[PDB]
Symmetry: C3
Subunit: 333 residues, 3 copies
């Protein structure tokens, strides 16, 4: 609710970065300039290069939408920036630096908006959001072929093997302290406790409810994995949190009106997001590749598509969907 006159002051370059500011927030569904800025802050706190590659992905994807002529409202809301952000981080997270790295980030960001547009047209038939699938599909397509096209070289995180039952480690208070905040950091490939805290503060600025569901998701994803007898190391590193962080955020009052029934619904989703993390990890291990946020995407899509069938689960028209605070105030209109 800013003064309408402030628009006399808009030049297209400050309009562009506002798109970038919010694009980044929309990685965790927060349509908020400051949230995104603070996301950047947190990534930059962990690494300068991932910081620039996050910005370039966001910039590359947002620009591509404008060049292609996406409706200005979609572009202004950050929906064509979120997946670019992740496309820019994932690539130097998984591959060793080569000069061509930046060009490839540009390509991957550019590709995300093609796919964002694809999914919005496809899923639009059911009012289901595209979530972060543009980044997963683009990045898989650009990463899988690395054994056949040697421009980049895979980092040691990528190692083809048949799955098998492998030791177990030891749960300590640290397992919990570190798993929690890295769970949140790992939403954007940030192996860093402080970054994760920064990310919660960043969400908190836009919404207390979403910040709380981000914390809960991470805890739910974490203890689901221990209940399921994961080795301690993946769990301390937030590997079983971050899909559930995203579940927590999206289910926890953004796409459904927060109440006691929608809350239990969101709990179901956070748990299955952790279990699905094991599932796609295994499915992709013969080619050594990361499932990324596909466990969040599949589970969440499942719960979103089911919504219109369940009368005790109150769905938000996606056209409308704002923060959980705003959705409840709106329902009282």
């Amino acid at each position: 609710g800013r003064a309408f006159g402030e628009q006399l002051l808009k030049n297209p370059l400050i309009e562009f970065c506002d798109s970038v500011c919010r694009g980044c927030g929309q990685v965790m569904f927060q349509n908020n300039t400051v949230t995104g800025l603070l996301f950047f802050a947190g990534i930059f706190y962990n690494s300068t290069t991932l910081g620039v590659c996050a910005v370039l992905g966001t910039a590359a994807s947002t620009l591509t939408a404008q060049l292609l002529g996406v409706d200005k409202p979609l572009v202004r809301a950050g929906l064509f920036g979120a997946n670019g952000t992740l496309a820019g981080i994932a690539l130097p997270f998984f591959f060793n630096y080569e000069p061509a790295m930046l060009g490839y980030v540009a390509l991957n960001g550019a590709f995300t908006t093609i796919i964002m547009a694809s999914l919005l047209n496809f899923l639009g038939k059911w009012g289901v959001p595209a979530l972060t699938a543009p980044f997963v599909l683009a990045t898989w397509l650009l990463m899988f072929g690395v054994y056949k096209l040697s421009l980049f070289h895979p980092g040691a995180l990528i190692a083809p093997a048949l799955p098998s039952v492998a030791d177990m480690g030891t749960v300590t208070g640290r397992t919990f302290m570190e798993g929690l905040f890295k769970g949140v950091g790992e939403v954007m490939f940030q192996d860093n406790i402080v970054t994760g805290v920064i990310f919660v503060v960043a969400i908190l600025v836009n919404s207390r409810i979403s910040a709380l569901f981000a914390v809960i998701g991470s805890l739910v994803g974490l203890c689901t994995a221990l209940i399921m007898h994961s080795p301690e190391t993946p769990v301390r590193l937030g590997l079983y949190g971050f899909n559930s962080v995203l579940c927590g955020i999206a289910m926890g009052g953004i796409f459904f009106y927060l109440n006691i029934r929608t809350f239990l619904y969101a709990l179901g989703c956070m748990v299955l997001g952790a279990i699905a993390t094991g599932a796609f990890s295994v499915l992709l291990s013969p080619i050594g590749m990361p499932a990324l946020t596909w466990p969040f995407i599949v589970v969440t899509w499942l719960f979103l598509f089911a919504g219109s069938m369940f009368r005790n689960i109150a769905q938000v028209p996606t056209e409308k969907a704002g923060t959980p605070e705003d959705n409840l105030r709106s329902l009282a209109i």
Copy 2:
């Protein structure tokens, strides 16, 4: 066509088991209380534990739909029970017993109805039924991650390997006798001739035509596999029947009006269901996992979606679709 007064006698607990009775029948698309009861009978004849785990899956999935508030008509028809039934059997069929087994069956049953609702909303745009895909997707998601989450331990049926050409065995009269009825038993993971016979009698009670297509499907799936030079062992064990049993049933006058053209159409589908069994078996072998009824699902979806394009193949509006006897009597309205 029961007296309407009989509803003065309905208490919610007898309403619940009627849902469970029919849920189970709907594993082979038979909206029939007695059929389901006899399915239970047959499973129980083979094993008491698979019997209870079948009931708990059915109970867990049906309850979840009611808790979530699915339209009472959908719940009363067993559509939210069929996939729960299978989710409850598959888990102790493939994994060794651990105390947590029952909770996990509850979880898996619960998950099926989420997915049932998902698919009904998605596929509803084309009037295409969800078949048994809720169970396949839920169970894959809950099974694949077992190498990474060690709560359960995979049975010896699960063994990651690269595919290769492997001896051939010897076809005998027994190959046929046993392959036929285990083909039907294996629709519900019942390695048992008597169970299979029980299952045919169970279908027969509701529909002679469906019982006949279940027999034919099994034979078609069986000899397709020999024509294709399968080793004798998978074929005697009904492994190449049961996807074709399901094809036979669904195509054979439930979703299409039985005539000479629809019959040949159903033959096409039963054959490709056998070939697809080899296909998904291979696709999933690097991670050692069962395709389950995915070969039936893909092929059948293909033929169902094609239906509205082929004018010589008379489709049933899925809203209406009852037994093959009732569909023909209805067409004569």
Copy 3:
């Protein structure tokens, strides 16, 4: 624009081969009798057996549509022939001859039209074409199971392995000369320079623009692969051209109105088609199977679905879509 009286001369057997003539052209989206004839010519120039197996697939698929009762206009345009053509070549390209080869080609052709009908009904909701996906899905289903059903034996091109980084070879003028025309030949599994030239002449007969985009696609797919540091051998053999040939053709003024913006759009697609070739090749290597034209299909579907979102990219209503020359003349109506 032939005299309408010429239809007094039509007997159903000459109507049938006209369907076969155009079916074959429609493998590269050319609704043109002579183009298809010349495609046949070119295949036959390379091999007599692939020639007959191309015709039988085309014949088997086209007949199945007529037997099933597809709208005569769809059948007359070759849309139910293109995928049959490829189903007939792929099978003896990848498997050693066995007597049953021809029956299987008939089966595979027959299956393509089921899937053509499936996809047309499914994708019809967005006006998106089915491209060559009927052939990929049918052929995968009929090929993957070969390790479990030994009727055919895989040729040495099929060899299950975990991916890994493998020497590099040496780019010469020949890499380019041979890569270019085999890029075009390989659209139909024709490892033959002359065949490829024949194919360009064949397209040229129907459309200069499409013939040019076929050449460009092949070059773009080729140098993308070198930029990406592919070994020289796959590139000289046209393995990185043919998905991009198809991209080039479909994007280059058939499905979008050719202009400076649509051209850059098509460039994006051709590049990602090459990168996706590496991607699906890797994804399917644990089971040793060819991605075929899936890299073209996924990328192209992505750009097609995105179309209606991008206002600077002018889409063709698919109902209407003819050659790029005719689309521009139509836009001037």
